[PDB]
Amino acid sequence: HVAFGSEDIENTLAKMDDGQLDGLAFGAIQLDGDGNILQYNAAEGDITGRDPKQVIGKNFFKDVAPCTDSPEFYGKFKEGVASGNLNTMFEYTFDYQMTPTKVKVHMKKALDSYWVFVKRV
Ligand SMILES: *C(=O)/C=C/c1ccc(O)cc1
């Protein structure tokens, strides 16, 4: 088990393959520094209606999740990629090609890549 917001979440998830990541209680996306989607788990698709196989390779901020292109989300992502120590938590609403859904988001650098964790609120 691993809880959303755990202090060493990136350690636990570093040791995980697809099945384990797909088993998480919360949405988990891994992005590269350009915002391209490396991994996208089953729990996230249950929040957003996206097929996890279909969004791998796409750009999260440009194409998949346009509502996240804002100082409040994308702005914080690039600040944390630049500053080297991404680790930030905030509320957000996801509303593109889905019913508007309130979530909380935790972005954290991976053990060169970057996690976006999501849970319904
Ligand atoms: C806003 O358009 C957000 C879209 C979105 C957020 C998270 C996802 O996993 C997919 C789309």
PDB file of C-alpha atoms and ligand atoms in Angstrom:
ATOM      1  CA  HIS A   1       0.000   0.000   0.000  1.00  0.00           C
ATOM      2  CA  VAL A   2       1.108   3.590  -0.570  1.00  0.00           C
ATOM      3  CA  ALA A   3      -0.859   6.658   0.399  1.00  0.00           C
ATOM      4  CA  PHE A   4      -1.345   9.802  -1.605  1.00  0.00           C
ATOM      5  CA  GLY A   5       1.007  12.472  -0.268  1.00  0.00           C
ATOM      6  CA  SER A   6       3.408  10.048   1.440  1.00  0.00           C
ATOM      7  CA  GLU A   7       6.751  11.691   2.225  1.00  0.00           C
ATOM      8  CA  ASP A   8       8.775   9.060   0.339  1.00  0.00           C
ATOM      9  CA  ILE A   9       6.188   8.306  -2.379  1.00  0.00           C
ATOM     10  CA  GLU A  10       8.826   8.616  -5.119  1.00  0.00           C
ATOM     11  CA  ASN A  11      10.973   5.950  -3.453  1.00  0.00           C
ATOM     12  CA  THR A  12       8.083   3.469  -3.290  1.00  0.00           C
ATOM     13  CA  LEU A  13       6.923   4.152  -6.833  1.00  0.00           C
ATOM     14  CA  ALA A  14      10.491   3.908  -8.221  1.00  0.00           C
ATOM     15  CA  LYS A  15      10.412   0.185  -7.350  1.00  0.00           C
ATOM     16  CA  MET A  16       7.104  -0.370  -9.205  1.00  0.00           C
ATOM     17  CA  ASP A  17       6.193  -1.793 -12.633  1.00  0.00           C
ATOM     18  CA  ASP A  18       2.927  -1.358 -14.590  1.00  0.00           C
ATOM     19  CA  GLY A  19       0.640  -3.700 -12.588  1.00  0.00           C
ATOM     20  CA  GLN A  20       1.628  -2.163  -9.255  1.00  0.00           C
ATOM     21  CA  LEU A  21       1.277   1.396 -10.631  1.00  0.00           C
ATOM     22  CA  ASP A  22      -2.111   0.436 -12.089  1.00  0.00           C
ATOM     23  CA  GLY A  23      -3.043  -0.819  -8.584  1.00  0.00           C
ATOM     24  CA  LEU A  24      -2.444   2.520  -6.821  1.00  0.00           C
ATOM     25  CA  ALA A  25      -5.336   4.183  -4.966  1.00  0.00           C
ATOM     26  CA  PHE A  26      -4.616   7.509  -6.709  1.00  0.00           C
ATOM     27  CA  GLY A  27      -3.952   8.721 -10.234  1.00  0.00           C
ATOM     28  CA  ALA A  28      -0.271   8.693 -11.188  1.00  0.00           C
ATOM     29  CA  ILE A  29       1.226  10.201 -14.334  1.00  0.00           C
ATOM     30  CA  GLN A  30       4.932  10.361 -15.086  1.00  0.00           C
ATOM     31  CA  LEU A  31       6.131  13.193 -17.310  1.00  0.00           C
ATOM     32  CA  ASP A  32       9.493  14.042 -18.749  1.00  0.00           C
ATOM     33  CA  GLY A  33      10.886  17.551 -18.379  1.00  0.00           C
ATOM     34  CA  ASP A  34       9.031  18.671 -21.524  1.00  0.00           C
ATOM     35  CA  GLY A  35       5.665  17.474 -20.181  1.00  0.00           C
ATOM     36  CA  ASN A  36       5.482  14.418 -22.429  1.00  0.00           C
ATOM     37  CA  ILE A  37       3.624  11.495 -20.884  1.00  0.00           C
ATOM     38  CA  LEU A  38       5.874   8.541 -19.978  1.00  0.00           C
ATOM     39  CA  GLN A  39       3.430   6.599 -17.781  1.00  0.00           C
ATOM     40  CA  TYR A  40      -0.272   6.993 -16.987  1.00  0.00           C
ATOM     41  CA  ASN A  41      -1.970   4.587 -14.592  1.00  0.00           C
ATOM     42  CA  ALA A  42      -5.382   2.960 -14.515  1.00  0.00           C
ATOM     43  CA  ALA A  43      -6.559   5.037 -11.548  1.00  0.00           C
ATOM     44  CA  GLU A  44      -5.918   8.264 -13.477  1.00  0.00           C
ATOM     45  CA  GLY A  45      -7.951   6.966 -16.440  1.00  0.00           C
ATOM     46  CA  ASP A  46     -10.778   6.231 -13.958  1.00  0.00           C
ATOM     47  CA  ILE A  47     -10.728   9.925 -13.003  1.00  0.00           C
ATOM     48  CA  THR A  48     -10.431  11.389 -16.490  1.00  0.00           C
ATOM     49  CA  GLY A  49     -11.806   8.896 -19.009  1.00  0.00           C
ATOM     50  CA  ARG A  50      -8.508   8.762 -20.940  1.00  0.00           C
ATOM     51  CA  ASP A  51      -7.197   5.416 -22.143  1.00  0.00           C
ATOM     52  CA  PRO A  52      -3.725   5.035 -20.524  1.00  0.00           C
ATOM     53  CA  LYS A  53      -2.298   3.225 -23.576  1.00  0.00           C
ATOM     54  CA  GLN A  54      -3.496   6.045 -25.881  1.00  0.00           C
ATOM     55  CA  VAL A  55      -2.030   9.067 -24.038  1.00  0.00           C
ATOM     56  CA  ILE A  56       1.531   7.698 -23.577  1.00  0.00           C
ATOM     57  CA  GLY A  57       3.793   9.816 -25.749  1.00  0.00           C
ATOM     58  CA  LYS A  58       1.468  12.814 -25.870  1.00  0.00           C
ATOM     59  CA  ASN A  59       2.102  16.191 -24.413  1.00  0.00           C
ATOM     60  CA  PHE A  60       0.179  16.675 -21.195  1.00  0.00           C
ATOM     61  CA  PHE A  61       0.034  20.479 -21.138  1.00  0.00           C
ATOM     62  CA  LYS A  62      -0.488  21.064 -24.839  1.00  0.00           C
ATOM     63  CA  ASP A  63      -2.849  18.319 -25.896  1.00  0.00           C
ATOM     64  CA  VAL A  64      -4.167  16.006 -23.178  1.00  0.00           C
ATOM     65  CA  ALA A  65      -4.897  18.382 -20.312  1.00  0.00           C
ATOM     66  CA  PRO A  66      -5.234  21.886 -21.793  1.00  0.00           C
ATOM     67  CA  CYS A  67      -6.939  23.236 -18.654  1.00  0.00           C
ATOM     68  CA  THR A  68      -3.677  22.632 -16.749  1.00  0.00           C
ATOM     69  CA  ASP A  69      -1.798  25.087 -18.974  1.00  0.00           C
ATOM     70  CA  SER A  70      -1.779  27.865 -16.388  1.00  0.00           C
ATOM     71  CA  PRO A  71       0.600  29.504 -13.918  1.00  0.00           C
ATOM     72  CA  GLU A  72      -1.179  27.499 -11.186  1.00  0.00           C
ATOM     73  CA  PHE A  73      -0.274  24.066 -12.622  1.00  0.00           C
ATOM     74  CA  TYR A  74       2.000  24.120 -15.655  1.00  0.00           C
ATOM     75  CA  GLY A  75       3.744  27.216 -14.184  1.00  0.00           C
ATOM     76  CA  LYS A  76       4.537  25.307 -10.981  1.00  0.00           C
ATOM     77  CA  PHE A  77       5.688  22.286 -12.998  1.00  0.00           C
ATOM     78  CA  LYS A  78       8.282  24.225 -14.936  1.00  0.00           C
ATOM     79  CA  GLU A  79       9.428  26.119 -11.783  1.00  0.00           C
ATOM     80  CA  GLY A  80      10.067  22.750 -10.104  1.00  0.00           C
ATOM     81  CA  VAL A  81      11.720  21.190 -13.147  1.00  0.00           C
ATOM     82  CA  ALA A  82      14.011  24.256 -13.345  1.00  0.00           C
ATOM     83  CA  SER A  83      14.729  24.568  -9.616  1.00  0.00           C
ATOM     84  CA  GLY A  84      15.512  20.816  -9.425  1.00  0.00           C
ATOM     85  CA  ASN A  85      13.381  19.776  -6.472  1.00  0.00           C
ATOM     86  CA  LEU A  86       9.765  19.468  -7.703  1.00  0.00           C
ATOM     87  CA  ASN A  87       7.437  18.790  -4.731  1.00  0.00           C
ATOM     88  CA  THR A  88       4.193  20.720  -4.612  1.00  0.00           C
ATOM     89  CA  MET A  89       0.508  20.243  -3.707  1.00  0.00           C
ATOM     90  CA  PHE A  90      -2.627  22.202  -4.760  1.00  0.00           C
ATOM     91  CA  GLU A  91      -6.307  21.923  -5.705  1.00  0.00           C
ATOM     92  CA  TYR A  92      -7.529  22.032  -9.310  1.00  0.00           C
ATOM     93  CA  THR A  93     -10.518  21.338 -11.511  1.00  0.00           C
ATOM     94  CA  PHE A  94     -10.255  19.070 -14.552  1.00  0.00           C
ATOM     95  CA  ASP A  95     -12.888  20.019 -17.132  1.00  0.00           C
ATOM     96  CA  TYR A  96     -11.710  19.218 -20.685  1.00  0.00           C
ATOM     97  CA  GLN A  97     -13.737  16.522 -22.484  1.00  0.00           C
ATOM     98  CA  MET A  98     -14.959  15.317 -19.062  1.00  0.00           C
ATOM     99  CA  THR A  99     -17.514  16.403 -16.441  1.00  0.00           C
ATOM    100  CA  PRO A 100     -15.822  19.127 -14.353  1.00  0.00           C
ATOM    101  CA  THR A 101     -14.066  17.205 -11.565  1.00  0.00           C
ATOM    102  CA  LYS A 102     -12.457  18.704  -8.471  1.00  0.00           C
ATOM    103  CA  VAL A 103      -9.153  17.114  -7.584  1.00  0.00           C
ATOM    104  CA  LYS A 104      -6.045  17.667  -5.563  1.00  0.00           C
ATOM    105  CA  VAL A 105      -2.691  17.373  -7.238  1.00  0.00           C
ATOM    106  CA  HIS A 106       0.764  16.506  -5.922  1.00  0.00           C
ATOM    107  CA  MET A 107       3.689  16.985  -8.322  1.00  0.00           C
ATOM    108  CA  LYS A 108       7.042  15.497  -7.287  1.00  0.00           C
ATOM    109  CA  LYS A 109      10.345  14.775  -9.027  1.00  0.00           C
ATOM    110  CA  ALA A 110      10.997  11.062  -9.642  1.00  0.00           C
ATOM    111  CA  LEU A 111      13.982   9.332  -7.984  1.00  0.00           C
ATOM    112  CA  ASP A 112      14.982  13.487 -14.566  1.00  0.00           C
ATOM    113  CA  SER A 113      11.237  12.690 -14.699  1.00  0.00           C
ATOM    114  CA  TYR A 114       8.325  14.007 -12.757  1.00  0.00           C
ATOM    115  CA  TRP A 115       5.235  12.587 -11.129  1.00  0.00           C
ATOM    116  CA  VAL A 116       1.780  14.106 -11.226  1.00  0.00           C
ATOM    117  CA  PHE A 117      -0.431  12.479  -8.602  1.00  0.00           C
ATOM    118  CA  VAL A 118      -4.174  13.094  -8.571  1.00  0.00           C
ATOM    119  CA  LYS A 119      -7.022  12.300  -6.206  1.00  0.00           C
ATOM    120  CA  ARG A 120     -10.708  13.267  -6.331  1.00  0.00           C
ATOM    121  CA  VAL A 121     -11.897  15.644  -3.613  1.00  0.00           C
TER     122      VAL A 121
HETATM  123  C1  LIG B   1      -7.916  19.860 -18.041  1.00  0.00           C
HETATM  124  O1  LIG B   1      -8.262  19.977 -19.200  1.00  0.00           O
HETATM  125  C2  LIG B   1      -7.413  18.738 -17.504  1.00  0.00           C
HETATM  126  C3  LIG B   1      -7.335  17.613 -18.218  1.00  0.00           C
HETATM  127  C4  LIG B   1      -6.747  16.344 -17.745  1.00  0.00           C
HETATM  128  C5  LIG B   1      -6.176  16.221 -16.483  1.00  0.00           C
HETATM  129  C6  LIG B   1      -5.627  15.003 -16.107  1.00  0.00           C
HETATM  130  C7  LIG B   1      -5.614  13.939 -17.004  1.00  0.00           C
HETATM  131  O2  LIG B   1      -5.051  12.773 -16.607  1.00  0.00           O
HETATM  132  C8  LIG B   1      -6.174  14.058 -18.270  1.00  0.00           C
HETATM  133  C9  LIG B   1      -6.729  15.270 -18.643  1.00  0.00           C
END
